[PDB]
Amino acid sequence: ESCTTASSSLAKD
Amino acid sequence: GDIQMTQSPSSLSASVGDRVTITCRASQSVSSAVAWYQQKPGKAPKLLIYSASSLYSGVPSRFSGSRSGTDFTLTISSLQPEDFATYYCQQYKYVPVTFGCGTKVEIKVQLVESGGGLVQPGGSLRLSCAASGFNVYSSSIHWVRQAPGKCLEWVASISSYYGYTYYADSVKGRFTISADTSKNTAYLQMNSLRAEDTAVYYCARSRQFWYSGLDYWGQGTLVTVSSAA
Amino acid sequence: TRVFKKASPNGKLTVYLGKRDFVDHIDLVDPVDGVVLVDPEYLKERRVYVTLTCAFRYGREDLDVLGLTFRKDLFVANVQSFPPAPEDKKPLTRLQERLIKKLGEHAYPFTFEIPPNLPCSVTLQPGPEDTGKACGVDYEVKAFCAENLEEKIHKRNSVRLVIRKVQYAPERPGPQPTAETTRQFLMSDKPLHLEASLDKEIYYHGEPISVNVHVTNNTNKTVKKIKISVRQYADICLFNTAQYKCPVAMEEADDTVAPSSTFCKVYTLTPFLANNREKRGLALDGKLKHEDTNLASSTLLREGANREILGIIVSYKVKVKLVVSRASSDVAVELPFTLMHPKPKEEPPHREVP
Fold this sequence. Notes:
The structure holds 3 protein chains of 3 kinds.
Chain A: E1 6-9
Chain B: E1 5-7, E2 11-13, E3 20-26, E4 34-39, E5 46-50, E6 54-55, E7 63-68, E8 71-76, E9 86-91, E10 98-99, E11 103-106, E12 110-114, E13 117-119, E14 124-132, E15 141-146, E16 152-159, E17 164-167, E18 175-180, E19 185-191, E20 199-205, E21 221-225
Parallel strand pairs in B: 2-11, 13-21
Antiparallel strand pairs in B: 1-3, 3-8, 4-5, 4-9, 5-6, 7-8, 9-10, 9-11, 12-14, 14-19, 15-16, 15-20, 16-17, 18-19, 20-21
Chain C: E1 2-7, E2 13-17, E3 32-38, E4 48-57, E5 71-82, H1 94-103, E6 107-112, E7 122-124, E8 136-145, E9 158-163, E10 178-183, E11 192-198, E12 209-217, E13 223-236, E14 245-253, E15 261-269, E16 283-285, E17 312-324, E18 331-337
Antiparallel strand pairs in C: 1-2, 2-3, 3-6, 4-5, 4-8, 7-8, 7-16, 8-9, 10-11, 11-12, 12-15, 13-14, 13-17, 17-18
């Protein structure tokens, strides 16, 4: 009964 | 299940002192568990970049990497006359970690392997890896086969600090790994041998307490199988 | 760079965090700064809060049986998130503003302050048949959509994620710790003398530690056998101190030092998990979900601290044991030292099967 940890990205400055 | 790291720039040349790019396509989401190496004709393949971003110690900054999604790019702003080699892309988020075939580009601490040679089909043999200057209990040990004219493939691994042994499917219960921590050595016994076994195998250092790229390896040893003597 | 994200079961709640660890800068620990993504359409109860706590599983069994969740809460704090208070105002951090630019006004930041004197994220080695949560010390970030904190937080109405505190070796290595003794005997005109020392003070896990020992055995008696024990002084303050200790590295030598003799020799010891796997109750560092970890780092006690933390203290000591011809004439000499992470650089890409 749980979810899943994933990730994401960014841009410098 | 198994992970593939395909390479688009399979064949390049005629490039001198310029910015060139290297694209590895990941068969699955791999985040940053990706590393790139470079290899000369038949030498020890040294580390270039790990986590796609951290360039190694000493390596010229002309080498750079970047990641966009599961897609991976290498830049050389200018090709120094010695840079010509085959450059290998490899994901390391999942066992088995997988290497794709690299990129031929051309123009017109101690660690050593040992114990190789030719063996008849169905034979058995022992491969050794002497290591010096560091410690097995802080460094993982990995054997990787290089089939000539085929990509790289991790085959064997010891976590001495954890005492775990990883192998690949083609060597489940067939090739065994061990390490004499006293002698700082890796040993691998090969059973029931076939044609695929004929390749040059390398042993390679990790940094076990906190994993990173495969940094310094051996000189590689040939293991040949043939029906003749 | 990259940012980690976690979703609530209902989808009403999407937390973004940057790093799953925190640099205990000794003086300070990096603040728990993150952002939450909310859906005001799905949100109907208009009140959202997110909790950080340093919490400890009360040790293993309860009602003499494993189960339940006796979180012995070392510290709890929660923050009003949506709507952000018109009162609480702190400057935004670079990471969080970058996230907002990725997201917009629908996301809302939060900043948690970690005081010193707080335990490092450690966990006790679970026994072989421990299918429950690995009992130990760790920090937890949980988001939820509730009217008030009194509200019985629905697990559906909430999402959770765990975080670990870490420490890294001070750049200056410590001076060599040494210890010398001289044991007199009623039967010996002159006393036995012992000296023990280590190569350095700072150490890294997985690399061997080297001890020198010198002995003057000019008594009527001999030094029969010598035992080398790297031991884990783990102290707990659940209600009071408890110096629960377990050997980690055990080396034996039959190096006989006779009466009227000298001795000096070097030994190497190497802690690791495998040999101590079957020793249930050992202490390891941070523990994410179920993964294999490393051995507990050398927990740092602040010099200015009052040593009154109700947490977990991990220190490491080597002991040399001299057996004598046969009274408790056999003598053990103790030498503390530090065993903990090298300098930090990145995240823990722990190796495991897909």
